Subunit: 258 residues, 2 copies
């Protein structure tokens, strides 16, 4: 929608965390980076979807959603690994200056940004909200008692782990879509039984089910009808069944003879 203020609110963590010399605010910025990367990928995909399919892209540009999601996950692991290495160095070499002031202000900025994002949404968004509250609590802990100093790297560790756990399922879905498995919603067996219940169909040879993206599903089959049947009627009835029951965007059914 109009979530452009999240990008300027991103800048607060980058500079404010620099002054504070903090890593928990870096994990807050990494979570925000994953969110804004998902939003930017969705916007770019929506812009690309209106473009018609060319002679070199026979399906269109519906894989941009999955590619953008994969890129966002890769960048999130970028930041997570960098912060993991930095925190591991920080722990052993216990020589770094952290001031709780800038930490507290930028953590407050982060929690209000998360509240605005939650309002816009109105899951792992609430999970992240909890993570932002944890970072804010760590900021109070550091600022109030400066003698404590290892609060920052431990929060970095826990919240990076939380980020990885939260975005694991998206990685799984993207991987399955890219490897061209059956879509999550659609089961192979219900589709096969639907195909065989068409009057005339005797067997199906090569039933292919795959998804271009989360909402775009394609199908193919090799139905073999009984000789005393009308291929056009059988094909039309099977396509209507697929469209009505499973919402397949495309359905190419080769009708052979038994």
């Amino acid at each position: 929608a109009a979530c452009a203020v999240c990008f300027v609110f991103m800048a607060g963590e980058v500079v404010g965390g620099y002054l504070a010399h903090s890593l928990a605010i870096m994990t807050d910025a990494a979570h925000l980076l994953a969110d804004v990367g998902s939003m930017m990928g969705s916007l770019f995909s929506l812009w690309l979807s209106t473009r018609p399919a060319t002679r070199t892209m026979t399906f269109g540009w519906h894989r941009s959603e999955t590619l953008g999601a994969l890129a966002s996950v890769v960048s999130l692991w970028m930041v997570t690994g960098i912060l993991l290495y930095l925190a591991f160095v920080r722990l052993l070499h216990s020589d770094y200056h952290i001031e709780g002031g800038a930490m507290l202000l930028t953590a407050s900025i982060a929690v209000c940004a998360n509240l605005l994002m939650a309002f816009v949404l109105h899951v792992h968004v609430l999970g992240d909200l909890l993570q932002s509250f944890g970072v804010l609590a760590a900021s109070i802990l550091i600022y109030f008692k400066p003698q404590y100093k290892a609060a920052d790297p431990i929060s970095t560790f826990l919240f990076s782990i939380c980020a990885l756990g939260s975005t694991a399922p998206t990685l799984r879905d993207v991987l399955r879509i890219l490897m061209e498995g059956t879509p999550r919603n659609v089961g192979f067996e219900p589709v096969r039984d639907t195909l065989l219940s068409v009057p005339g169909v005797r067997a199906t040879h090569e039933l292919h089910l795959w998804a271009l993206t989360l909402t775009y599903h394609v199908a193919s089959a090799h139905l073999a009808i009984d000789s005393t049947a009308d291929p056009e009627a059988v094909l039309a009835e099977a396509s209507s069944r697929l469209y009505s029951r499973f919402g397949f965007s495309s359905c190419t059914l080769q009708v052979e003879q038994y």
Copy 2:
């Protein structure tokens, strides 16, 4: 079994570059990592492809090649970016100790390893030879004249650029395959004309051409035959034409009526 002897050789790059405190050895190791990942993914993809297709993966596991290639490219950019940042830091902060007493030996190990890989292969092999020779020349310059010190970062920059330029085309091919475009070898127009030249076919509605991997191609169509035609004969002739001319692994042609 090329990497059966260059995986241990890769170990010498990491330790040898550690003692030498060098970054050109890191770019040599990055090129070796790209090659290692590429054909290790090839081996893993073959081992996955020998498995049959399940109810979940209706097309089999032929996308593992593309996924492994993408992972290898991502890891190469990992190393390249890390080395870019390290070299940029090393340039303006000109305070580091580099000795050729390990640089020269590790560069020699790298060049003999690259020669052995070229023999095994017996294209970017000549680029790899040139880059390894450049690293070796930088090592000779550093060891012979210790007063020069900025040789390491500049070579790091040039050979990182060489690596990125060399693996750009693989990234482009992987991106096209994942976005489900027409394969490079197969042209949309020749396939369409082949389909329309079948006796009986009037027009094709939805011609879909896409590739599971580099060597696996799939096709679909919606041929609309003449009233006075035999659908089975037309379908068989079209499938045989596709298989013989374009080598399509699968061909699902829906035969409608005009």
